[PDB]
Amino acid sequence: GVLKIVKVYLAVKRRIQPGDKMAGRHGNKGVISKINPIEDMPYDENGTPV
Amino acid sequence: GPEEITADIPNVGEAALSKLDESGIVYIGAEVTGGDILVGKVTPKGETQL
Amino acid sequence: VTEFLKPRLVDIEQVSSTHAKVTLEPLERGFGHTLGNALRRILLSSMPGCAVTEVEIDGVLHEYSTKEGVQEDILEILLNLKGLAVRVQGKDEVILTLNKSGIGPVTAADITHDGDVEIVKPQHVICHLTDENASISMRIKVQRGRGYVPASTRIHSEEDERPIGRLLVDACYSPVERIAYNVEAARVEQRTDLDKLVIEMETNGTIDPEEAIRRAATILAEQLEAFVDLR
């Protein structure tokens, strides 16, 4: 019954966003709640943010 | 009758057929988003019974 | 009591092309940290800079492809061009051209010379040509802006992007990489409660340190007008 098939391949770049599940190797899973501006993050004596 | 892969689609403007080639298939490299036609296809119908 | 001593830009210690130390002095008690964190939060978010926003590589249609003779995928070339540091004088958009043939690294020193454009790290590798008959040719659109504008914000804003083969790059426009500040005691003539504020500043080399301090203080002073008036 099939006369022809056209297969399209889409490449989607998925950036990380609130709701994406992130995890460590020690069973510490979690979901991103906020994406915080860099000047809002905690930072050490040298100004390097976390 | 046979369904037809075509760029000639009813009730669809020339803007939505902008990234389809003369065969009704999307170009490679085309940045598409949700709802964009990738392969244009029409199915023959009949007895619309207005 | 009702009059404060006001700071002045005392010293710029340019440690590197991309690292500086600005001293503001003298500061009253408590104003070191007030000004330090306000200036850090503005320097870290609000500075303007030029970023690569679009690339047209000559034979490529999308970034999930490979050029023949080039060792890197087009996506990796675009990631290398995302980190290209340019300062554009007297324009808000320029198109640089890179043509390069033969075996070797294609670096930022190989971008053709525009008069109003300065590449601050010419040793910045963009790709590697691994074939003597290989050649790369691209049109890199550098644009001035502010903050972080991903290409997703920019695809379907119309932009008349009829060409398939024009690849959008996410634009991180901020020239400032790191701000630290430290409040030391000043050595002023009579007083002992006066501070000085040292702002250590890592940039990509494309903004003057004093110019960025002036710009951040101007942004503060323009945001304070709504409170100075307060109607």
Which CB contacts under 8 angstroms, 24+ apart, belong to B34-41? B37/B9, B37/B12, B38/A6, B38/A8, B39/A6, B39/A8, B39/B5, B40/B5, B40/B6, B40/B7, B40/B8, B40/B9, B40/B12, B41/B3, B41/B4, B41/B5, B41/B6
Is residue C210 within 8 Å of C12, Cβ to Cβ? Answer: yes
Phi, psi of C8 (to 5 degrees): -140, 150
Contact C50, C143 (CB under 8 A): yes
Identity of the residue numbered C28 = E
Specify the length of chain A in residues.
50
Site from C57, C58, C61 to mutate, B interface, most B CB atoms within 10 angstroms: C61
Phi, psi torsion values for C110, nearest 5 degrees: -95, -5
CA distance C219 to C176: 16
The C-alpha atoms of residue C112 and residue C199 are separated, in whole angstroms, by: 36
Chain C residues with CB inside 8 Å of B33's CB?
A: 155-156
Of all helices (H) and strands (E), which one includes residue C76?
helix C74-82
Dist. CA C12–CA C20, nearest whole Å: 7
Report which secondary-structure segment, H or E, holds A30: strand A30-31
Q: Which of C40, C41, C150 minimises the CB distance to A15? A: C150
Residue C41's H or E segment, with its range, is helix C31-43
Among the listed residues C79, C150, C57, C151, the one whose alpha carbon sits nearest the alpha carbon of residue B31: C151
For residues C137 and C165, is the Cβ–Cβ distance under 8 A?
A: no
Q: Taking CB atoms and an 8 Å limit, are B39 and A8 in contact across chains?
A: yes
A12 touching C, CB under 8 A?
no
What CA–CA distance (Å, rounded) separates C34 from C54? 39
- A18 Cβ contact partners less than 8 Å away, ≥ 6 residues apart: A31, A32, A33, A34, A35
- B17 burial level (CB within 10 Å; 0-12, 13-18, 19+): middle
Query: How far is the C-alpha of C207 from the C-alpha of C205, rounded, in Å?
Result: 6
CATH topology of domain C48-172: RNA Polymerase Alpha Subunit; Chain A, domain 2 (2.170.120)
One DSSP character per residue, chain B reads: ---EE-S--TT--TTTTTTB-TTSBBPTT----TT--SB-EE--------
Smallest CA-to-CA distance from A19 within A5, A30, A4 is with A30
Identify how the structure was determined. cryo-EM
Q: Which two tokens stand for residue C183?
A: 């409040």
Distance from C-alpha of B49 to C-alpha of A19, rounded to nearest angstrom:
48
Does residue C175 contact residue C49 with C-beta atoms inside 8 Å?
yes
What is d(CA C64, CA A13) in angstroms, rounded to the nearest whole number?
A: 10
Number of Cα atoms under 13 Å in the Cβ half of residue A23: 6
Q: How many C-beta atoms surround the C-beta of residue C173 within 10 A?
A: 17
Half-sphere exposure of C153 (CA within 13 A, CB side): 9
Residue C176 tokens read as: 């400032």
Q: Which of C182, C172, C180 is nearest to C202 (CA)?
A: C180
**Resolution of the experimental structure, in angstroms:** 2.5
> Do C200 and C19 touch, CB atoms closer than 8 A?
yes
Using the beta-carbon criterion (under 8 Å), do C165 and B30 form an inter-chain contact? Answer: no
3-state SS record for C159-191 = CCCCCCCEEECCEECCCEEEEEEEEEECCCCCC
* Structural tokens at position B42: 């029409």
C40 and A47: CB-CB below 8 Å?
yes
Q: Sort out which chain C residues have CB atoms less than 8 A from A9's CB and list them.
A: none
Ranges of beta strands (E only) in chain C are 8-14, 19-27, 48-57, 86-88, 93-101, 104-107, 117-119, 125-129, 135-146, 148-149, 166-168, 171-172, 176-185, 195-203
Contact of B15 with chain C, judged by CB distance below 8 Å, is answered with no
On chain B, the residues whose CB falls within 8 A of the CB of A10 are 32
Helix/strand/coil for C156? coil
- What distances in angstroms separate CA C187 from CA C23, C29, C33, C34, C190, one per listed residue? 13, 14, 18, 20, 9
Q: At what angle do helices C31-43 and C209-223 cross, to 10 degrees?
A: 100
Of A9, A10, A13, which to mutate for an interface test with C (greatest number of C Cβ within 10 Å)? Answer: A13
Torsion angle of the four alpha carbons C208, C212, C214, C220, in this order, in degrees rounded to the nearest 10? 180
CA distance B9 to chain C (A): 21
- The DSSP annotation for C209-231 comes to HHHHHHHHHHHHHHHTHHHHH--
Q: Are C46 and C54 in contact (CB under 8 A)?
A: no
With beta carbons less than 8 A apart as the criterion, state whether A17 and A35 touch. yes
What is the rounded CA–CA span in Å between residue C176 and residue C202? Answer: 6
Residue with tokens 């990489």: C177
Q: Note whether C57 and C135 are within 8 A (CB).
A: no
